[PDB]
Each structure stands twice: as structure tokens, then as C-alpha cells.
Design a protein around this ligand. Structure first.
Ligand SMILES: [Mg+2]
Ligand SMILES: [Mg+2]
Ligand SMILES: [Mg+2]
Ligand SMILES: [Mg+2]
Ligand SMILES: [Mg+2]
Ligand SMILES: [Mg+2]
Ligand SMILES: [Mg+2]
Ligand SMILES: [Mg+2]
Ligand SMILES: [Mg+2]
Ligand SMILES: [Mg+2]
Ligand SMILES: [Mg+2]
Ligand SMILES: [Mg+2]
Ligand SMILES: [Mg+2]
Ligand SMILES: [Mg+2]
Ligand SMILES: [Mg+2]
Ligand SMILES: [Mg+2]
Ligand SMILES: [Mg+2]
Ligand SMILES: [Mg+2]
Ligand SMILES: [Mg+2]
Ligand SMILES: [Mg+2]
Ligand SMILES: [Mg+2]
Ligand SMILES: [Mg+2]
Ligand SMILES: [Mg+2]
Ligand SMILES: [Mg+2]
Ligand SMILES: [Mg+2]
Ligand SMILES: [Mg+2]
Ligand SMILES: [Mg+2]
Ligand SMILES: [Mg+2]
Ligand SMILES: [Mg+2]
Ligand SMILES: [Mg+2]
Ligand SMILES: [Mg+2]
Lengths: 55, 104, 136, 175
RNA sequence: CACCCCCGUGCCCAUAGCACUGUGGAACCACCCCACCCCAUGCCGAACUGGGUCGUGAAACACAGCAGCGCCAAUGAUACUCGGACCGCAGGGUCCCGGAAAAGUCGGUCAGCGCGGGGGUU
RNA sequence: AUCAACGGAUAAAAGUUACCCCGGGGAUAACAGGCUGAUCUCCCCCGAGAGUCCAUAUCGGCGGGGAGGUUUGGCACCUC
RNA sequence: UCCCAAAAUGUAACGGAGGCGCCCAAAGGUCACCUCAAGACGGUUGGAAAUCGUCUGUAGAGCGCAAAGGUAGAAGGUGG
RNA sequence: UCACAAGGCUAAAACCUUAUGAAACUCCGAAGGGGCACGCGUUUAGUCCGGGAGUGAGGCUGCGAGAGCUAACUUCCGUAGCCGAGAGGGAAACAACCCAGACCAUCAGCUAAGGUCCCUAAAUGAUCGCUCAGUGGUUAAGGAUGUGUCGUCGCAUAGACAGCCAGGAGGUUGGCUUAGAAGCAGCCACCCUUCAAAGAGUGCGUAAUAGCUCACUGGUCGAGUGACGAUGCGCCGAAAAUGAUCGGGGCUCAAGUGAUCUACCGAAGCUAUGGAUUCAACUCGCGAAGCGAGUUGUCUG
């Protein structure tokens, strides 16, 4: 998949923070490419709502 | 009433003991004294008494103790555990005992 | 009214009605619509209303029953020093639960005796009539 | 009655006034969804002892009976239905409504007719011919008079799942 | 095990249990009989124990039948619910997404897998 | 070893102060305010019953729904 | 010790209930043996309950004391 | 185990059908959580040894509970987030809520929550409806031929709902009660007669009669009309103290509202260009390490 951080981490729960951290995004507007596998696509599920996900 | 047998039965720690347990069955005027490796569902030696008995009915205990222990020599069994039954270790099954207890 | 022997004190919480939403022991039935607490005397009130309106004799099934002790601290005490001592008894009627069953009376009679009981009640209600054979 | 779809997904029908249902053959098992309006007219007419014809939007039409119904507690309305796909010569056990007939000579000296158990579950009829009601006479009945489950006239080829000394339609004193 | 059956003993710990019921006898088991001693009874060979039959397989056990009970138990739907969002002053309630019971209905089932020995297949 | 104030200040110990003093506290009470509204005040619903007769002329049991913030309080939020 | 305590541990309140500051020389060690409550039928004192017998009987009993967990193949009752 | 609703049954208990409550009940039992292994796949923290501390009054909201009155800008715990120690936009104003974490410069571009009649940046936008009450712009039981939308049932070309003419009957003051009760202050039953139709009968009435009228039928007309719920928006119920008001002007010939669509405005968030700092790695000078320099990345409440 592709990925964009289009929401924010403040006032968001600890784990969702640390998961934003993992997925490599550290600022809004950050985009990224992601490797369709259960642990990474399972890292995008849990912070789904903060992300504009492409394909 | 089945309490005595399942009692001593569990009281013989099956596997973790290492040693082999040794059944009996002197209720009828025929017995069965089996030797078992507990863990594996297999029965090793054994020495019955209903394939000819000489004649003795309870006097023959020592005989099948000696016969069993004889089978134990060959198969290579030197360690043992005495799985009695509802049988209160006294005469007959004591004979089977003492018999195997020397004639190993 | 009261339970006869027990433990003493309790608590409070809510979601929709366990059993039973269905109409046994009777032909017409009255159903909660709101998550109230219901005091003895409130039922007592509905019982006496309906009992009078039916005269002799009809048949009245008061399904709900107050097992829950509610307490109230003494007059003018600063909080603490204890828990309040059993003011009265409530029955935790959740929505949909059937509070009342009456039978041996016409539809008209049932409507009225119901409405009269309703105006005595802490919560909105609705009357209905059988078909609820979930079991019997 | 003419349902159509049956996926595990309900959004296709929810508001549109349809009930989730299942009809099982005991060999064949099929989920689906019926127009509410219909099944309302229906189940009102035929009740639990029903028997009506069910043609799935695929051509194949099978007869069936109503085994259970599942309600919204707060809206008091059908949301789901358990449906028995009937057999032929022996079915299952049928719950049927005790009624009452004629002015009892109980309501004329003090008391009233009280159907102490509204719904009587019998074993078998031969399905094709199910008793849908069950008239009991009461005119003989005085006040203090219980009718056990034995004394009910079954319509031949019918037995009683009931303990037949259990109190049914009994007439009660006044006050 | 060659085929059966019986005796012991296990893995299994009720879809493997119980009732009703039929079968079984010198070949294993059982009751049986005797007991002054080994041994034993808070009293009594009932039980432990000891010497042994016949007799009976009735009791008990083994095996078969059976779904009355017991136990096991769907799919369907729902309760609730992680997490996304909301309404209501409040008691409380809704929507989207995934997970998802319990009880009940369908049913399923008079278990299955071994080891050793005995005894039978004119 | 009721060192039981139970991690146990000394071997060994009570009161009083309106004659009172110091250092602090709005970390904490009495006044007032604030928040609440059980209690307190009023208004509404049902109507059993009273009114010869007739619920509502007037009164209104058993119970229900609100308002107000003038009572006694609750809380301790600015002011020691 | 139980509940609160939000199915890991933990978790406060002048929140909701109840025990302890011992006892046992056998109530311990081991060895061996025994199986409970309760109801139904019938039974000299009895006749609600006593003691005996038959049938049912997975715990509906017992465990020195509180309760929770536990336990009938014993921790339960008896003897060397 | 404790508690509990109607009935059976029995001498009450047990037991039988029906039926239900539980923090300190449990035949069962999720979602979730916790431990361990891997890393099957991303990312950056960790742990230990030693120096220096400060803190030990917390605060709100949501969810979960107790206490409390299912009171408190209440109290005590669990849990997430924020304030504390957080500036910036929004919520008129407003620690906490919603958006969002500010290295510096800019008279540059895009967005978030929230907004686009004038004060006030931005559509007096579009289309299908709703409400006419200033609802909008704060409460309830209760009430109501308000209005939209569904559904149920009923009556009707055998003439109905309404309107209008007439009958409304004989037993019979039905019995009971009563000082009298005769449809009509209270207890039991609703039977016959005549007909196209007239019911021990509904309200008013009388101390009780008598009296007025309805339930039924006929004509008359000439067609629909009546009841019961479900739901959208409103109406009433709605009374406090210095002067009013949604923040204001004002809004329905919507600036209110339910739905769907798009265009724009909006922050110290993102972006453009320039620049400095932190750390890091790479390259170089001198004499490894170290200091300075430079580039890339990175960071900087
Ligand atoms: Mg949620
Ligand atoms: Mg779902
Ligand atoms: Mg699933
Ligand atoms: Mg069998
Ligand atoms: Mg000292
Ligand atoms: Mg003085
Ligand atoms: Mg002086
Ligand atoms: Mg003086
Ligand atoms: Mg001073
Ligand atoms: Mg004062
Ligand atoms: Mg004060
Ligand atoms: Mg008052
Ligand atoms: Mg009166
Ligand atoms: Mg005050
Ligand atoms: Mg203060
Ligand atoms: Mg405080
Ligand atoms: Mg937890
Ligand atoms: Mg703490
Ligand atoms: Mg089950
Ligand atoms: Mg401190
Ligand atoms: Mg502190
Ligand atoms: Mg705290
Ligand atoms: Mg507070
Ligand atoms: Mg701020
Ligand atoms: Mg601000
Ligand atoms: Mg501002
Ligand atoms: Mg504030
Ligand atoms: Mg927007
Ligand atoms: Mg402008
Ligand atoms: Mg730059
Ligand atoms: Mg920053």
C-alpha cells in the first residue's frame, strides 16, 4: 500500500503514537510505501483512521 | 470397593518412577501377574497359571513368582514396582512376592 | 412490597431487559419503555388502582418485584461515617420488560385499568396482547 | 411468501422492511430474508402450527412450518425467524392454543374461566393435517374445577407431550 | 490376535453414563462351601483372609440391543464488545468496522484406540 | 513486648487558658458568595374519595412530573 | 478471607460483610484400613431429631476455629 | 446459595408446569487483556555501572465503579487524553473541549477543526424536501381535528360519515336496596312482544315521577369517511429579583432545518525560498583520539 499521515498524534492514545512512529511517519504530510504483509498491513489497520491509504 | 485398587494404582506413580510395575490378580483360583512399562501402553513379560498349574491352587504362588522372575531374567528386567490389587499382601501374593524377590 | 430476609445494601448500573418481554399468565399486558427504578409503593399504587377499577374480580399479575435496597443518609450529615441505612426498596425494571398482566376483563377494561396505572408510574409505558410464544 | 437473497450481510434489506430468517430441512439448510409485511399477515394467520409455501428467488418452492421467532425487546417486533422445513408423514411436536367454548357455569355463580396454560405442546399428527386450535368444553365446569391435560380430545393420531394430570383451563373463584 | 471370545491392564476421562432388555457357563469370571489355624472383624469368614468342590449362571460382571433420561451440540440471529465516531441535562442511547457469545432450535451419540496372556475355529 | 498508636521516639509522663503569645493556612471551619437542590417553597398530571345526588363549585387520598434558589444542609471553589 | 477490583498481578474511601493474637503429644511422621448429607419404605424405648435395615445417593457432607479456593483414587472417619 | 410471580400437588416442606432478580449466585461465558517464542517486518528505543537532581498538594473531560440523592466546578479508585510545564486556529468571552506541538526571517501557496447575509476571511451556492412556531436561540410527566410521511382496521354504488324529518317502543316501577330509587345513589342478569327500526338502554334531569336525547331503522341526499398506532418538524405545559438580546445587527421573498454535491476562507499544522543550531555519518587539515570547516540527513514548546 501507499500511505499518508493526514491526521495528528496529539490527544491520541500511546500505542497509536508508537505505531505512527513505526510506520516511519513523523509529521503530517508524510507519505510512504508499505509492504503488503500481515504485520505491516496490521500496523496500518490499528492507526487506519489517521491515514490516507492509497492502494 | 474399587477404591483399594485405584488407590494403590495411582499410588504407584506410573511413569515418573522409572521402574516397571508388576500386576497380579489372585481373586479367582487363577492369577495373571503382568510386568508393565506403565508409560508405553505395552506389557513386557508376564507369567499366567491357567495353562496347566501342577495342581496347587494357592500353594503355587511361589511357582509363578519364580516363573515370572524367570521371564524377567531373559527380557532383562532388574527393577520393579509391586502393583498389588485389592490384595492385602499376606500369603499368596506374598508368596508370589518372596519368590520373585529372590528368583529374579 | 418487601423481601423477607437477605444481605442488606447494594449498587446501580444499566442495559436492556433480560427476561421477559413476553405475555404469559394473561391476555393483556403492560410494558415499561424506560430504564427506571420502581419502588414498592409505586407498584402498590398500580395494584390498588387496577384492583379497584376491575372491582371484583378480574385477574392481576404483578410480574415485577422490588428486591433492591436503596439507602439514604440521615438528615444533615457530612458525607462519610458510613453507608446510608435502607430507605426503601426498588425493582430495576429495564425497557421492554413486562410489568403487568391482566386478564378476565374486556379490552376496554384492560386499556383503562392500564392507563390509570400508567399515570401513577415514573415512566412511559405501552399495553399489548399475546402472540409472544418464545415459550409457554 | 417470496424471499430473495440470503447473504451473511444484512444492509441489503434492513430498513426495507425484511426479516432475517433460516429454514432448515435437517439435511438441507438455507438462510434468507422475507418481506416483513408478508410474514406479518402470514404468521398472524397461521401461527406456530402454520404451514406455508416458500419459493426462493431461484425457482425452487418448498413447504414449511414456524419453529421460533426472535424479537426486538424494545420495539416489540420481529428481527429474526427460525423455520422448520416440513417433512411429510411424521413432523415434530406442535404447540397449539387451548381455547374455551360456551358460557361456563362458573362465570354465572362467582368465578371466571382461566386458561392456566395457554399453549399445549402435543406430539405429532401426521403433518399435512395439524390441529391449529383446540376447543375445550367448559359448560360443565363449576368453581373449583380443574381440567387436567388428559381430558383433552385429540383428533386421532395425536398424543400428549404434556404430563396429562397437569392443570390446564381451570375456573377460579372471585375476589 | 489368523478369526472369535474371555481375563488382566492401559490411552481416553459421559457424544464413553444410567435405566428397561436380551444373551452368556465348565472356559475364563462370579456367586458358592468349609474355616481350628495364617489373616481378619470397634460385633459377625458380610469384608480382609485361608483350604477347595460340585451346583448355579440367575445376583454381580462381559456383550449386544435401544435415544426414555443423561451428555455432546449446529448453521441463523442476537447479547455484549476492541477500535473508529456520535445523541441525550441526565437515567441512558445510536452509527460504521472487525471480533463474538451464553441459553435454545437442527441434530449427534448406547464410544473409540492399544498391550499382554488364556481359551476355543471336524 | 495489648512496645496493640502493632516498622516499635524515653528506662520513666496528665490537664487547662476567655490573660494569652509566635509562625503559617483560604492546604481548613464559623459570615457572605459560588456549585448542587435531598430538605424548603411554590406550580402541573392521574383520580380513589368528600360535596344529598354530580371527581374537578370548591377539596383531592395512594402515586407521578417540574419550577424556583428566599430554609436547614451538602461540597470547600475566590477572600484567614 | 470475600466483594468492590473494570476475566493477568495491582488498586482508594469514616465503601459493603466476617474472623485472628490460638489450638493439637495426636489434630503430627509413616503404614494399613473405612466413605459422606439427605429423602422414601419398614422398624422395642422412639415415634420433629434418637439407634437398625433396605433402596436412592458426586459431594446436596466433613475438614479444631473466619471465609475463599480446594478435596471422594482423600485433605474426610478408624487402627498399628 | 439467597431472594421472588401465578398455579398444581400434598400435610406446610419436598416435588410438578409456568416465570424472574443477584457486587459478595455460577451450567456456561465473549470482546479485551497479561506472560513466553519468534521478527516471518516496520521502527527506534533499551539495560547496566557511576555523578547531580527535583518531585511526594494535582486539575478537568470521556469510559469503568464505589461513596453521594444514578446531586455538586462533589469525594475516592481504575483507564485514555489534555492542563499542569502548551503558545497557534475554533468553541462570542473561556487551564481542560475540537483542530493542532511554535529553530528564526517573508506584504508567498495548500489545508485541519470550524466556517462563507453585514459587523467578520470565505457560495445571499446548487437540487429534493421540512418547519411559520422566531421553533431556531436551553426541562419534564401530562396534554393537543398543527402539519408532513408510512402502516393497521372499519364503514360505504345493499346509498354510508355529517346535516335534516320521525319513531323511539308492551311486558316493566325487572329483581334486590330503600323514607322513596321507577334506564339513570349502591348488589345479580341482560329474556320476550310488535316491526323496515326501537337496546332492563347513554348524558342531563327529580327528594323519587314526569321530562330532553342518544345506540337501531326509514326517507333525504350524494359521495367517500371514520377509528388505531408509527414516525419527521413544530404547539401548550414554560413564574424571580439592576436592562434587554441567538455574541449583535438581522434572518422564513431562509441567514432555521433533514438529506446529497461541489467551490472558496481559515492555524506558529503542511508547503515554497533563505538562514542558524542539535546530533549523525561521510570528506578533508595536524599529531590516532580531539578542535574547526564543509556537504547530506536530522533535530530544535
Ligand atoms: Mg466505543
Ligand atoms: Mg456488528
Ligand atoms: Mg466470526
Ligand atoms: Mg451396554
Ligand atoms: Mg524505648
Ligand atoms: Mg471571666
Ligand atoms: Mg492582663
Ligand atoms: Mg480572671
Ligand atoms: Mg497570630
Ligand atoms: Mg449558617
Ligand atoms: Mg457558606
Ligand atoms: Mg417539600
Ligand atoms: Mg360520593
Ligand atoms: Mg447556601
Ligand atoms: Mg479552599
Ligand atoms: Mg477537593
Ligand atoms: Mg483488568
Ligand atoms: Mg493510589
Ligand atoms: Mg448445555
Ligand atoms: Mg506527603
Ligand atoms: Mg499526595
Ligand atoms: Mg489522583
Ligand atoms: Mg472535584
Ligand atoms: Mg492553548
Ligand atoms: Mg486558545
Ligand atoms: Mg477569539
Ligand atoms: Mg473552565
Ligand atoms: Mg471541512
Ligand atoms: Mg466578506
Ligand atoms: Mg528549508
Ligand atoms: Mg517544535
Amino acid at each position: 500500500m501507499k500511505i499518508k499521515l493526514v491526521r495528528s498524534v496529539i490527544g491520541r492514545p500511546g500505542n497509536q503514537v508508537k505505531t505512527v512512529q513505526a510506520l516511519g511517519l513523523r509529521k503530517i504530510g508524510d507519505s510512504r510505501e508499505v509492504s503488503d504483509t500481515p504485520a505491516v498491513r496490521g500496523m496500518v489497520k490499528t492507526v487506519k483512521h489517521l491515514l490516507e491509504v492509497q492502494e | 470397593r474399587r477404591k483399594l485398587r485405584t488407590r494403590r494404582k495411582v499410588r504407584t506413580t506410573t511413569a515418573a518412577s522409572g521402574k516397571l510395575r508388576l500386576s497380579v490378580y489372585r481373586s479367582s483360583k487363577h492369577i495373571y501377574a503382568q510386568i508393565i512399562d506403565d508409560s508405553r501402553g505395552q506389557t513386557l513379560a508376564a507369567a499366567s497359571s491357567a495353562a496347566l498349574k501342577s495342581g496347587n491352587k494357592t500353594d503355587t504362588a511361589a511357582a509363578v513368582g519364580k516363573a515370572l522372575a524367570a521371564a524377567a531374567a531373559e527380557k532383562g528386567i532388574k527393577q520393579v514396582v509391586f502393583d498389588r490389587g485389592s490384595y492385602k499382601y499376606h500369603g499368596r501374593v506374598k508368596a508370589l512376592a518372596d519368590a520373585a524377590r529372590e528368583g529374579g | 412490597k418487601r423481601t423477607k430476609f437477605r444481605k442488606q445494601f447494594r449498587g446501580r448500573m444499566t442495559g436492556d431487559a433480560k427476561g421477559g418481554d413476553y405475555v404469559a399468565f394473561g391476555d393483556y399486558g403492560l410494558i415499561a419503555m424506560e430504564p427506571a427504578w420502581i419502588k414498592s409503593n409505586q407498584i402498590e399504587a398500580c395494584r390498588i388502582v387496577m384492583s379497584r377499577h376491575f372491582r371484583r374480580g378480574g385477574k392481576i399479575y404483578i410480574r415485577i418485584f422490588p428486591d433492591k435496597p436503596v439507602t439514604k443518609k440521615p438528615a444533615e450529615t457530612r458525607m462519610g461515617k458510613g453507608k446510608g441505612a435502607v430507605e426503601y426498596w426498588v425493582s430495576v425494571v429495564k425497557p421492554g420488560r413486562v410489568m403487568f398482566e391482566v386478564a378476565g376483563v374486556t379490552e376496554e377494561q384492560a386499556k383503562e385499568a392500564f392507563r390509570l396505572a400508567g399515570h401513577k408510574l415514573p415512566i412511559q409505558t405501552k399495553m399489548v396482547k399475546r402472540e409472544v410464544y418464545d415459550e409457554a | 411468501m417470496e424471499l430473495t437473497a440470503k447473504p451473511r450481510t444484512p444492509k441489503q434489506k434492513l430498513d426495507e422492511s425484511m426479516i432475517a430468517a433460516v429454514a432448515y430441512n435437517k439435511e438441507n439448510n438455507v438462510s434468507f430474508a422475507l418481506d416483513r409485511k408478508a410474514f406479518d399477515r402470514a404468521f398472524r394467520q397461521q401461527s406456530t402450527t402454520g404451514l406455508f409455501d416458500i419459493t426462493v428467488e431461484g425457482g425452487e418452492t418448498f413447504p414449511a412450518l414456524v419453529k421460533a421467532v426472535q424479537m426486538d425487546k424494545r420495539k416489540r417486533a420481529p428481527i429474526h425467524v427460525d423455520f422448520y422445513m416440513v417433512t411429510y408423514g411424521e413432523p415434530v411436536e406442535v404447540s397449539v392454543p387451548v381455547h374455551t367454548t360456551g358460557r361456563s357455569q362458573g362465570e354465572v355463580q362467582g368465578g371466571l374461566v382461566d386458561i392456566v396454560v395457554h399453549n399445549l405442546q402435543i406430539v405429532a399428527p401426521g403433518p399435512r393435517r395439524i390441529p391449529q386450535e383446540l376447543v375445550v368444553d367448559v359448560t360443565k365446569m363449576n368453581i373449583g374445577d380443574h381440567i387436567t391435560a388428559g381430558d383433552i380430545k385429540l383428533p386421532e393420531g395425536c398424543t400428549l407431550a404434556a404430563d396429562p394430570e397437569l392443570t390446564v383451563v381451570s375456573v377460579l373463584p372471585p375476589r
